[PDB]
Amino acid sequence: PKIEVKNDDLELALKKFKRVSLEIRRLAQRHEYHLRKGMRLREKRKIAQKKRRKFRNMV
Amino acid sequence: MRKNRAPKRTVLPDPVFNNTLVTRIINVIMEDGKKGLAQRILYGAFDLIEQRTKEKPLTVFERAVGNVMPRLELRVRRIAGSNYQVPTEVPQDRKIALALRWIAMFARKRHEKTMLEKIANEIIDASNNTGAAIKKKDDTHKMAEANKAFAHMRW
Amino acid sequence: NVSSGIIHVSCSPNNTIVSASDPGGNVLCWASSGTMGFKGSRKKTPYSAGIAADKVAKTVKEMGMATVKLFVKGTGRGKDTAIRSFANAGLSITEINEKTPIPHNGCKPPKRPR
RNA sequence: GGUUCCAUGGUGUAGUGGAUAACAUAUCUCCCUGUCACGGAGGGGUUGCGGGUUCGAUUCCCGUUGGAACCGCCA
RNA sequence: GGGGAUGUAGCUCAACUGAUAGAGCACCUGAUUUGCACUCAGGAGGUUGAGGGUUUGAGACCCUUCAUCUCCACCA
RNA sequence: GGCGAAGGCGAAAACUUAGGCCAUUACUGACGCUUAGGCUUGAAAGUGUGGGGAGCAAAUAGGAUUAGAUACCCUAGUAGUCCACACCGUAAACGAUAGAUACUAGCUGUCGGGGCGAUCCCCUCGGUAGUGAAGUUAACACAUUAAGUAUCUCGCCUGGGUAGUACAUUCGCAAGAAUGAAACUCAAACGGAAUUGACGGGGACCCGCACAAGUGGUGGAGCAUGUUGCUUAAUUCGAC
RNA sequence: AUCAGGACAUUAUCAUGUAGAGAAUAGGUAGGAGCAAUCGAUGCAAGUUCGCUAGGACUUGUUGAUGCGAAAGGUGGAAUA
Ligand SMILES: [Mg+2]
Ligand SMILES: [Mg+2]
Ligand SMILES: [Mg+2]
Ligand SMILES: [Mg+2]
Numbered sequence: 131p132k133i134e135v136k137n138d139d140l141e142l143a144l145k146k147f148k149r150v151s152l153e154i155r156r157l158a159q160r161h162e163y164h165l166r167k168g169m170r171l172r173e174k175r176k177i178a179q180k181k182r183r184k185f186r187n188m189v
Numbered sequence: 190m191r192k193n194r195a196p197k198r199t200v201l202p203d204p205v206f207n208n209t210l211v212t213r214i215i216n217v218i219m220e221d222g223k224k225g226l227a228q229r230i231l232y233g234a235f236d237l238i239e240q241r242t243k244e245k246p247l248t249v250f251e252r253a254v255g256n257v258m259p260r261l262e263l264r265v266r267r268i269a270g271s272n273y274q275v276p277t278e279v280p281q282d283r284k285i286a287l288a289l290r291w292i293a294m295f296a297r298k299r300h301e302k303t304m305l306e307k308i309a310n311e312i313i314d315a316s317n318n319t320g321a322a323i324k325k326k327d328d329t330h331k332m333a334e335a336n337k338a339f340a341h342m343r344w
Numbered sequence: 345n346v347s348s349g350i351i352h353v354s355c356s357p358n359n360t361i362v363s364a365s366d367p368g369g370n371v372l373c374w375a376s377s378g379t380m381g382f383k384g385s386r387k388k389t390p391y392s393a394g395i396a397a398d399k400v401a402k403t404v405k406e407m408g409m410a411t412v413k414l415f416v417k418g419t420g421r422g423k424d425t426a427i428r429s430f431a432n433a434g435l436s437i438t439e440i441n442e443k444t445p446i447p448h449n450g451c452k453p454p455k456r457p458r
Numbered sequence: 459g460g461u462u463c464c465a466u467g468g469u470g471u472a473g474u475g476g477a478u479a480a481c482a483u484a485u486c487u488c489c490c491u492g493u494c495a496c497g498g499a500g501g502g503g504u505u506g507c508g509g510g511u512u513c514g515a516u517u518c519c520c521g522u523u524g525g526a527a528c529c530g531c532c533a
Numbered sequence: 534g535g536g537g538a539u540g541u542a543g544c545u546c547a548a549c550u551g552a553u554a555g556a557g558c559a560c561c562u563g564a565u566u567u568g569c570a571c572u573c574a575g576g577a578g579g580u581u582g583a584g585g586g587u588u589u590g591a592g593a594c595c596c597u598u599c600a601u602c603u604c605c606a607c608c609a
Numbered sequence: 610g611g612c613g614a615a616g617g618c619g620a621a622a623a624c625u626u627a628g629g630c631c632a633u634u635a636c637u638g639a640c641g642c643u644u645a646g647g648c649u650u651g652a653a654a655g656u657g658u659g660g661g662g663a664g665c666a667a668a669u670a671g672g673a674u675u676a677g678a679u680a681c682c683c684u685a686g687u688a689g690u691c692c693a694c695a696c697c698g699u700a701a702a703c704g705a706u707a708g709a710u711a712c713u714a715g716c717u718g719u720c721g722g723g724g725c726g727a728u729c730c731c732c733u734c735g736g737u738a739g740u741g742a743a744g745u746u747a748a749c750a751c752a753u754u755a756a757g758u759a760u761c762u763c764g765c766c767u768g769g770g771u772a773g774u775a776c777a778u779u780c781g782c783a784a785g786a787a788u789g790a791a792a793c794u795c796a797a798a799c800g801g802a803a804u805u806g807a808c809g810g811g812g813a814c815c816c817g818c819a820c821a822a823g824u825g826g827u828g829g830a831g832c833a834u835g836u837u838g839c840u841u842a843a844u845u846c847g848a849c
Numbered sequence: 850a851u852c853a854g855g856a857c858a859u860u861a862u863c864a865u866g867u868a869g870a871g872a873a874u875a876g877g878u879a880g881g882a883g884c885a886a887u888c889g890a891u892g893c894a895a896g897u898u899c900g901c902u903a904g905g906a907c908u909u910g911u912u913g914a915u916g917c918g919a920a921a922g923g924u925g926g927a928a929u930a
């Protein structure tokens with residue numbers, strides 16, 4: 131997950147790096163705990179439903 | 190849970206050296222509701238300060254009290270076990286208040302003679318950064334410096 | 345004695361590690377929250393991560409490098425305090441690449457404490 | 459019948475090479491709680507019997523009780 | 534018997550081959566707990582075994598004793 | 610979101626192979642639905658033999674916490690989790706809703722085939738969802754994928770505890786599975802839905818010397834007064 | 850037989866080097882009391898010595914005709930060519 135600094139400013143790098151790390155942290159923390167396959171599908175289905183319903187009202 | 194900010198009573202400019210702070214410390218050394226007695230004791234100490242330090246009493250008092258005055262305050266915040274402390278910047282009004290409260294408490298415990306000379310020695314002893322009030326200010330400051338890490342989380 | 349190099353900064357949820365290394369292997373210096381003097385639970389606080397970065401930044405700057413590739417690691421809490429620590433030290437941060445181990449569904453993770 | 463060990467507070471156990479006896483539980487008083495348990499503070503309570511040595515015995519010595527542990531074979 | 538060690542605070546041990554009397558834990562007070570502890574601050578506690586000499590000076594260097602620790606040989 | 614009757618199926622490829630949807634000027638001409646008995650499949654755990662074992666972790670050991678902790682936390686850790694061949698045949702195996710057939714407003718999505726030809730969008734035929742009236746229901750709710758109007762067939766139910774227990778029987782190497790009572794006891798049941806409160810170491814909001822910030826006290830001492838206990842011929846009675 | 854490595858001895862290598870005080874890094878003794886000048890002054894620049902981060906000596910570069918109060922002056926246990 132390389133992001134170039136562009137050497138024009140520093141903040142901008144961290145403004146993109148905050149996003150990249152958050153999506154990175156989701157899977158990093160997911161492959162930290164063992165749920166049964168049924169429970170694993172439940173959290174996958176749970177996140178999709180949250181994101182969907184949230185996306186409906188900003189569109 | 191109150192949503193209301195308390196009012197503040199006037200501090201009054203001092204009646205001699207015209208230095209407000211004298212009235213506050215007078216009220217601090219007040220005991221038994223004696224305005225008179227407290228004034229006499231305190232003013233008498235300035236006559237001894239003249240006799241001893243050969244300098245202006247108001248200047249010595251500001252140099253002692255302003256120097257004893259602390260900067261950081263550690264507020265106790267318990268969650269599960271013991272309390273992790275939080276250093277916060279004290280407002281200016283409260284800043285002066287702890288110094289005066291502290292000056293009197295260590296004055297009424299010295300091995301000296303009549304509290305007149307007792308309090309006189311404490312004020313002259315704090316103008317040179319070597320006393321009992323200094324140690325208290327040093328101790329709370331060192332705890333805050335030790336507890337710099339937990340300053341970001343307050344409540 | 346080298347101009348460019350790599351600094352791996354691993355941020356575990358319980359501790360942190362900052363390793364300054366040559367562009368390929370062969371670390372030149374290292375520091376950690378334990379070596380600072382913090383012990384027990386305080387080692388996992390962002391302030392400690394910043395403190396560790398400051399000492400290692402100071403040591404390696406006297407050794408004399410300018411361009412730094414920052415291999416950020418871990419999933420702790422002080423993952424950005426050490427990054428900002430280097431920036432106030434003034435080293436030239438060139439890349440902000442992240443290399444926290446991610447699995448592709450390999451190995452079963454431990455059980456959940458409850 | 460014979461030989462070794464033990465007897466310390468209310469209960470389980472340490473010490474003492476003569477001058478001195480503690481630990482835990484238990485007990486009592488007070489915080490603690492609607493109340494009680496748990497928790498906190500403080501308080502208290504001791505050498506099996508006898509008989510000698512010593513200025514002085516729980517300790518050292520010889521006997522007498524009680525409780526144990528060992529043995530009591532060859533024909 | 535021969536060699537090698539040690540003695541510094543209440544309890545262990547650093548020193549430093551000569552110029553500091555120290556570190557840690559026990560004891561005490563302060564911050565802090567539901568407690569119990571952990572943590573944080575301060576403080577004391579020494580003929581540096583004795584004796585003699587070195588050096589301008591010593592606990593140290595050397596000599597000799599006292600005590601304990603180790604060892605390392607043993608046909609009355 | 611897709612597929613399969615269910616369990617289930619998600620890196621890529623090859624071989625073998627199952628079912629399904631749409632249009633049929635083709636063909637057979639009732640050959641169809643259900644199914645006691647029977648057969649096949651059937652999550653995970655478990656069994657037997659032989660391999661495999663990185664990670665994790667029942668049993669087990671230790672450190673914590675605790676009044677106690679054989680548990681929740683942490684460090685280790687065997688069987689097991691994996692493969693091949695043999696068994697076991699149970700699950701909240703759930704859409705808690707057997708299969709088949711015909712009919713009954715509508716609206717919004719999404720997927721596949723077909724018709725048009727940039728998609729997008731429109732129509733037709735089906736699968737999978739949401740909302741929704743008549744209708745049904747004790748209510749929650751179902752509502753063209755019915756729990757609605759009706760038909761066929763199979764399986765199952767007859768108060769609660771005893772009890773899925775005991776005996777007999779069948780299967781299984783084993784644990785066990787299937788089948789399955791009674792004596793005795795109760796007036797109801799860890800019955801169903803819904804309502805008003807209370808409560809929550811459930812949330813959201815708002816108040817008071819509540820906490821916080823200060824001041825002066827109490828608990829330690831002497832004394833005054835009241836109470837508990839004890840005593841006494843009585844220590845009159847009540848307030849706890 | 851050969852190679853490489855460090856053990857410990859060295860042939861042979863001389864700065865090192867840090868009581869106060871003293872102007873001073875005082876390693877101990879310079880025999881002593883002025884001495885060095887192509888047997889080359891003096892100058893400042895670079896590196897190194899080790900550190901008691903003040904200072905030390907040494908080398909290199911400038912490099913040329915008087916330096917050396919580390920002779921005589923200094924204090925000190927230790928001392929000035
Ligand atoms: Mg875990
Ligand atoms: Mg009370
Ligand atoms: Mg016989
Ligand atoms: Mg299985």
Ligand SMILES: [Mg+2]
């Ligand atoms: Mg155990």
Ligand SMILES: [Mg+2]
């Ligand atoms: Mg483990």
Ligand SMILES: [Mg+2]
Binds near residue numbers: 688689
């Ligand atoms: Mg097993």
Ligand SMILES: [Mg+2]
């Ligand atoms: Mg069943």
Ligand SMILES: [Mg+2]
């Ligand atoms: Mg509905």
Ligand SMILES: [Mg+2]
């Ligand atoms: Mg019945």
Ligand SMILES: [Mg+2]
């Ligand atoms: Mg049955």
Ligand SMILES: [Mg+2]
């Ligand atoms: Mg029942």
Ligand SMILES: [Mg+2]
């Ligand atoms: Mg209700």
Ligand SMILES: [Mg+2]
Binds near residue numbers: 821
């Ligand atoms: Mg308060």
Ligand SMILES: [Mg+2]
């Ligand atoms: Mg009282």
Ligand SMILES: [Mg+2]
């Ligand atoms: Mg009392």
Ligand SMILES: [Mg+2]
């Ligand atoms: Mg009464």
Ligand SMILES: [Mg+2]
């Ligand atoms: Mg009554």
